[PDB]
C-alpha cells in the first residue's frame, strides 16, 4: 500500500465564524494503522480568534483509524486517489457549521484543503465566549448511503461552568474511486488539545480512533 506505518500531514484551513475570517495552517504526523496522530496548528490570519477553538478541531482524516481485518476500511482503500468529506455540525443553541475537506497524498504526506464556516452562534453562548474545555470521547455511527459512507455522531463539549453543550455531526465521506463498502459499524474517538498558547495561535492536537462492531453478542 501507499499508506505506511508512519505518515506526515500538512493542511490549510480557511473559514469564518459569525462572519469573522481566519486562516490556520498545520503540520503533523501519525500512525494510520494504530489510529493515532498529532499535529501543530498555527493561526495565520484573523488573530485573535473570537470563538472556542474546539469547534475547529474535528475538521483538522479517517485514514487515522485502526480498522479490524473484518471491517472494510473505506478510507485507506481510497488512496492513492484519495477522498473528500462534507460535514454539518448542528449545535443545540442554533449555531450551525459546514465544513469540507479535500484529502490528497504526495509521497509520505497527506494534504488537506479545508473550508469551515460557522453561523448563528449566540453572542453570549459558550462558543463565542470561549467557555469550552474539551470534546468528550465519542462513538460515530458509520453506514453506507447512496454509494458513499455516512457518519453520524452525538458530540458534547464539556463546559467551564460544568455541564455539557451538545452538537450533532453528519458527515459524508466520498472516495474518489471504487472501494469495498463496509457494513454498519462504529468508530470510537478521543480528541484532545495537548497544549496551546494565549488566544490559541499555537495548538498541539491529538486524536485516537478505533473502528469496531458492537461489543455485545
Are residues 83 and 174 in contact, defined by beta-carbon separation less than 8 angstroms?
Answer: yes
Binding mask 13-42 for a copy of itself (x = CB under 8 A): ---x-xx-----------------------
Residues, the chain: 217
HSE toward the beta carbon, residue 61, CA cutoff 13 A: 34
Min dist. Cβ of residue 159 to Mg ion (A)? 8
Residues whose CB is less than 8 angstroms from the CB of residue 62 and which lie 6 or more positions away in sequence, other chains included: 74, 75, 85, 151, 173, 187, 209
108 binds a copy of itself (CB under 8 A): no
Binding mask 122-161 for Mg ion (x = CB under 5 A): -----------------------x----------------
163 binds Mg ion (CB under 5 A): yes
Which of 17, 24, 60, 66 minimizes the C-alpha distance to 42? 24
Q: What is the end-to-end Cα distance of the chain in Å, rounded?
A: 33
Binding mask 121-160 for a copy of itself (x = CB under 8 A): -xxx-----------xxxx-x-xxxxxx---xxx-x-x--
HSE toward the beta carbon, residue 137, CA cutoff 13 A: 8
* Residues near a copy of itself, by CB under 8 A: 16, 18-19, 84, 86-88, 90, 92, 94, 96-100, 102, 115, 117-120, 122-124, 136-139, 141, 143-148, 152-154, 156, 158, 163-164, 166, 168, 170, 172, 174, 184, 186, 188-190, 192, 194, 206, 208-210, 212-217
Amino acid at each position: 500500500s501507499v499508506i505506511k506505518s508512519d505518515m506526515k500531514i500538512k493542511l490549510r484551513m480557511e473559514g469564518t465564524v459569525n462572519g469573522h475570517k481566519f486562516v490556520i495552517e498545520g503540520e503533523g504526523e501519525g500512525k494510520p494503522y494504530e489510529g493515532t496522530q498529532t499535529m501543530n496548528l498555527k493561526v495565520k490570519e484573523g488573530a485573535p480568534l473570537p470563538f472556542a477553538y474546539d469547534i475547529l478541531t474535528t475538521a483538522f482524516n479517517r485514514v487515522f483509524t485502526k480498522y479490524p481485518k473484518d471491517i472494510p476500511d473505506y478510507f485507506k482503500q481510497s488512496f492513492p486517489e484519495g477522498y473528500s468529506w462534507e460535514r454539518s455540525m448542528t449545535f443545540e443553541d442554533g449555531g450551525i457549521c459546514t465544513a469540507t475537506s479535500d484529502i490528497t497524498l504526495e509521497g509520505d504526506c497527506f494534504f488537506y484543503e479545508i473550508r469551515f464556516d460557522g453561523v448563528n452562534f449566540p453572542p453570549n453562548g459558550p462558543v463565542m465566549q470561549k467557555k469550552t474545555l474539551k470534546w468528550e470521547p465519542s462513538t460515530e455511527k458509520m453506514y453506507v448511503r447512496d454509494g458513499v459512507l455516512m457518519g453520524d455522531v452525538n458530540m458534547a463539549l464539556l463546559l467551564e461552568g460544568g455541564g455539557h453543550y451538545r452538537c450533532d455531526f453528519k458527515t459524508t465521506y466520498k472516495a474518489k474511486k471504487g472501494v469495498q463498502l463496509p457494513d454498519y459499524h462504529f468508530v470510537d474517538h478521543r480528541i484532545e488539545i495537548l497544549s496551546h498558547d494565549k488566544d490559541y495561535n499555537n495548538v498541539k492536537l491529538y486524536e485516537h480512533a478505533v473502528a469496531r462492531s458492537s461489543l455485545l453478542p
